[PDB]
């Protein structure tokens, strides 16, 4: 079969791209985002265990082994995934496709199908190797959609606008073709026979024709701009509105840059949905008419012009791929240079302290030299292309003039006819030139369409929910954690066997070391992610059987890393609550020590917070988050290390406000310092993905164990 090389869309999906390439080689094609989510790809890339798990899910029979340099000589299953260390710095996954005579062919998702000397490969190859093979159930499929038709369906509401552009272009082309005979009428008829009044009349007519052509171009340009802007808005809004509905496994498995960069893909798609189709429809007919007219003028000159355009197309097609390879290399080098510059500026204090202003300058100079070399390579490619195209164009023009003069001498045509042919050369060559130049745009548009539309197929948060029982309207009750396992994707499990019960309305404390997994349970209670095994029950009813809406309004969260949105204080304190009066906000500002702070701020609860509230310090934002959570009016309220950044007075006020909370509401306090929370109704100490002992402080101290040791060592 042909060697399939699925280029990676992101910087961390090289393993997913390799698995997709193997699947496509073996006859199974699907979206790269789906394979990316089954591989458990995260912001740090993919490990071999994820690839094995995803391959076994797909129907393969995967196995991860470590091989030596000699094992490459021994014949095994050729389509295997292998680890390489690019630049001896970064890990990478590639696809080995055949074992040849001291030459290794590998699909690198970042580069393409490349060849290496066995020495070079084995120098960069790590011992890691993954072997893939279809199992009993590997029904070949094509579970992907043509994303160009899906985004071209946005042209249906704007069929009138597209139709008007077509008619305007037809009239513009007709007027230009008619006006390209002025030079023929001059030399052959008016100048030769010395006609003055006819000269003036015909010249005025052609000026009027040109003015009409200009007006038509103006109108068509306005319409094209409007169409492009409408398509851009539609695609971007669709993508963003779908992204806001996707589950949380989507958001934390991707960088912010990866999610945001799909917004330029909307413009890339629009450049072909509107530009390419309109260009094809107009220029095909315009080129056909121009070629027919040129052949009417003279067959030999038309054949010469056809040869000219054929040579230009050949040259451009030949130079296409190297130019884009050079551009990709330039982009990579620029990204490396800007990352180095940002790192050097951000960590200036360390560099000054250690006296490293000399080697940092040398490293930046080396990176700038690399960028300059890549820029020179691309500039040389463009210069060679321009030189060849200019040679073709100029020699074609000279040859056309030469052959036209020869034909005029032989009497096959007149001088005016030759000049009219030279004029119509534009209306014949520009259409074909544009049609050939559509090639780079369509490939980029296809790649961008795949990138953007593979996300629009992902199931949203609501679509993955089990049927909701409508009889539950109150989350008040005991919170029971059965045998609950959890893991962020396909990494080491965080929670193992946490079985616990939280009574109705009683304050509960969870303590442990950093990285133990407390915030993990805090998010699992809020239906961010789901337990791998077991279930989470509230008042007997399972959480999954309750509507996702009722979970998010009746449960409030105060994370350790609070987030502030750019907006007024009232807007920040009421994010989803669209109907709240001022007095409730005022009261909520009381128990969170926010009224005193914001009163001293200029104006009142209307100040816009610039750059995610960069003006306020960490404690002030944490108090704001406390106030928002209290204003939410929850039945369960979780505080994940909320008071760590606060002072003594603020911590005391928060404590006596939370303890003296009205209504039968449950409070969960996740803390690292035991002395912060000691009077809680019950305390749960979980160390390795499971609780080892539960009880009050008077009960935990008496019973010798992990909690007693931690209390003795910390205090």
């Amino acid at each position: 079969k042909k060697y399939v090389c699925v280029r990676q869309y992101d910087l961390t999906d090289c393993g997913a791209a390799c698995l997709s390439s193997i699947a496509q080689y073996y006859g199974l094609k699907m979206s790269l985002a789906k394979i990316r989510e089954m591989t458990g790809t995260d912001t740090q890339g993919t490990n071999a265990y994820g690839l094995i798990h995803a391959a076994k899910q797909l129907g393969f029979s995967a196995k991860g082994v470590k091989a030596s340099k000699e094992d490459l000589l021994k014949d095994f299953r050729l389509p295997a995934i292998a680890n390489v260390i690019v630049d001896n710095r970064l890990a990478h996954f590639v696809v080995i496709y055949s074992i040849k005579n001291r030459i290794i062919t590998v699909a690198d998702p970042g580069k393409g199908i490349v060849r290496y000397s066995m020495d070079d490969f084995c120098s960069i190859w790590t011992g890691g190797l993954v072997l893939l093979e279809p199992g009993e159930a590997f029904q070949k499929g094509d579970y992907t959609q043509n994303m160009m038709v899906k985004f071209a369906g946005f042209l249906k509401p704007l069929k009138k606008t597209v139709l008007c552009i077509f008619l305007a272009s037809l009239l513009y082309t007709a007027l230009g073709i008619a006006g390209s005979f002025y030079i023929k009428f001059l030399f052959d008829d008016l100048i030769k026979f010395e006609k003055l009044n006819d000269l003036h009349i015909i010249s005025a007519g052609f000026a009027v024709i040109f003015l009409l052509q200009i007006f038509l171009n103006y109108y068509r340009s306005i319409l094209v701009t409007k169409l492009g802007m409408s398509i851009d808005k539609s695609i971007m809004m669709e993508y963003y509105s779908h992204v806001l509905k996707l589950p949380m496994n989507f958001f934390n498995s991707r960088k912010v840059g990866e999610i945001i960069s799909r917004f330029m893909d909307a413009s890339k798609i629009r450049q072909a949905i509107s530009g390419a189709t309109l260009t094809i429809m107009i220029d095909t007919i315009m080129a056909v008419i121009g070629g027919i007219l040129l052949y009417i003028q003279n067959s030999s000159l038309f054949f010469i012009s056809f040869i000219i355009i054929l040579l230009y197309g050949i040259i451009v097609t030949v130079f296409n791929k190297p130019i884009q390879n050079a551009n990709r290399q330039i982009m990579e080098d620029n990204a490396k240079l800007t990352s180095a510059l940002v790192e050097s500026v951000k960590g200036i204090e360390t560099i000054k302290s250690f006296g490293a202003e000399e080697q940092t300058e040398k490293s930046t100079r080396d990176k700038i030299e690399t960028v300059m070399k890549s820029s020179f390579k691309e500039g040389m490619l463009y210069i060679n292309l321009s030189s060849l195209t200019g040679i073709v164009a100029g020699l074609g023009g000279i040859v056309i003039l030469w052959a036209g003069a020869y034909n005029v001498i032989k009497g096959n045509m007149s001088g005016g006819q030759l000049l009219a042919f030279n004029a119509l050369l534009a209306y014949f060559l520009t259409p074909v030139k544009n049609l050939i130049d559509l090639q780079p745009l369509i490939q980029t548009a296809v790649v961008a369409s795949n990138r953007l539309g593979e996300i629009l197929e992902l199931a949203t948060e609501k679509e993955l929910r089990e049927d909701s029982d409508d009889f539950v309207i109150s989350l008040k009750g005991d919170i029971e954690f059965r045998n609950v396992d959890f893991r962020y994707g396909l990494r080491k499990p965080v929670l193992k066997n946490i079985n616990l019960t939280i009574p109705k309305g009683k304050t509960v404390a969870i303590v442990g070391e950093s990285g133990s997994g407390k915030t993990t349970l805090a998010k699992l209670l809020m239906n961010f992610y789901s337990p791998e095994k077991g279930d989470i029950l509230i008042n007997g009813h399972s959480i999954k059987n309750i509507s996702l809406e009722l979970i998010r309004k009746k449960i409030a969260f105060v994370s350790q890393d609070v987030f502030i949105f750019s907006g007024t204080v009232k807007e920040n304190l009421c994010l989803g609550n669209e109907n709240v009066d001022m007095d409730e906000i005022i009261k909520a500002a009381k128990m969170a020590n926010a009224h005193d702070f914001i009163e001293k701020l200029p104006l009142k609860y209307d100040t816009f917070l610039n750059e995610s509230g960069a003006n306020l310090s960490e404690g002030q934002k944490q108090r704001l988050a406390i106030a928002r959570a209290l204003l939410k009016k929850p039945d369960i309220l979780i505080l994940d290390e909320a008071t760590s950044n606060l002072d003594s007075i603020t911590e005391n006020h928060i404590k006596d406000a939370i303890y003296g909370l009205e209504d039968d509401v449950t409070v969960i306090i996740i803390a690292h310092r035991l002395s912060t929370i000691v009077n809680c109704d019950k305390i749960y100490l979980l160390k390795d993905g499971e609780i080892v002992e539960s009880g009050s402080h008077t009960e935990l101290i008496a019973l010798k164990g992990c909690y007693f040791k931690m209390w003795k060592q910390t205090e």
């Binding site: 961390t12 090289c14 393993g15 740090q44 890339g45 993919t46 490990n47 071999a48 265990y49 690839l51 094995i52 196995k63 991860g64 082994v65 470590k66 091989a67 094992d71 021994k74 095994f76 680890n83 970064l90 890990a91 990478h92 996954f93 890691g128 190797l129 072997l131 396909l490 990494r491 080491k492």
Partner: peptide, 17 residues
């Protein structure tokens, strides 16, 4: 065959970012 099979921990340790 053709190699030494890694266990699960070694598999997850084989980072390919």
């Amino acid at each position: 065959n053709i190699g030494r099979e890694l266990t699960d921990e070694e598999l997850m340790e084989m980072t390919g970012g």
